[PDB]
């Protein structure tokens with residue numbers, strides 16, 4: 001039968017966390033109850049540890065972000081903010097690829113834009129929200145409906161201005177993790193020095209485009225965050241569809257194991273295709289996220305483990321360095337049960353608990369696994385995610 005090895009001595013990326021977006025200008029804010037469902041880690045709560053928000057172009061809208069951002073922080077989360085457009089007096093229009101009236105930040109206003117981002121940072125700080133990071137731009141390379149930045153404009157801002165931002169600087173938030181938006185920053189010593197978090201979105205991003213050798217070479221001291229996605233679609237009322245929801249778990253496994261990502265952040269938290277339904281309950285897509293978010297907590301470290309021990313079975317493992325305990329998340333996308341011997345050499349652990357989601361149950365506690373020495377034999381139900389803790 002199939003075997004996997006978890007190697008607790010081969011440490012990979014430190015986990016920062018998991019979460020999603022609030023946008024109270026475009027859609028309704030989270031309600032009081034929804035804030036707790038998202039950021040609490042009790043029964044029937046998602047255990048999210050990252051909130052993302054927008055930086056409005058009109059400072060008279062900033063007050064609308066405060067209640068949800070404050071609640072998330074109270075429940076243990078960190079908050080990152082991204083702008084879509086500068087204030088209109090800083091914007092000029094230009095023609096891009098033949099399309100007129102497109103927006104870019106006026107070059108002669110780069111310093112004024114820093115002051116706008118800093119004014120947001122200071123406004124949120126005055127209201128009890130200490131931002132973990134602020135982005136230069138949401139999707140500078142997909143800005144048909146907002147503000148475009150070329151790779152060079154992004155680079156010049158990163159090199160010449162981003163040092164003046166009073167927060168961690170996240171860039172470039174390419175819509176698809178396109179390396180042409182980030183390579184210039186990683187290759188310029190001043191820009192790289194001004195960077196703190198390499199942020200990327202995953203819209204259309206394949207497994208082969210998840211590794212990033214340049215970042216493994218140049219990225220020492222920088223974090224690596226996947227700051228927006230929905231998968232496998234944004235279809236109306238799709239969030240409970242099965243086995244489609246297993247794609248959410250698989251995308252997260254891939255982000256962690258193939259991309260070495262430290263954070264994975266959904267789009268709108270509350271939406272008919274999101275982790276929280278419009279009625280405030282958790283969706284099947286939400287339970288997929290929860291198999292990671294509720295158990296792989298911030299500061300756990302991913303470790304090397306057999307990622308794909310048999311066809312349609314995917315394994316990731318994270319270690320809590322406080323006690324060398326292990327959290328393993330195993331996805332079985334097969335329509336048949338799979339029996340695996342999981343070897344964890346040199347562990348003192350002899351018993352694992354397990355929680356299982358299928359099409360018919362959500363995070364169901366099942367019977368404990370007893371090890372024979374350092375080997376744990378596990379049977380995975382068909383079309384399931386199991387978290388072993």
Ligand SMILES: O[C@@H]1[C@@H](O)[C@H](O[C@@H]2CO[C@@H](O)[C@H](O)[C@H]2O)OC[C@H]1O
Pocket residue numbers: 026145
């Ligand atoms: O003018 C604003 C639009 O730009 C906005 O459209 C959003 C663009 O980002 C997409 O990810 C959203 O799905 C889409 O709704 O909507 C509000 C409007 O004021």
Ligand SMILES: O[C@@H]1[C@@H](O)[C@H](O[C@@H]2CO[C@@H](O)[C@H](O)[C@H]2O)OC[C@H]1O
Pocket residue numbers: 139142175203204
């Ligand atoms: O809301 C937008 C998405 O609709 C957009 O979707 C991607 C566009 O490029 C395609 O190659 C991808 O398959 C698709 O996921 O991503 C950006 C986002 O703002």
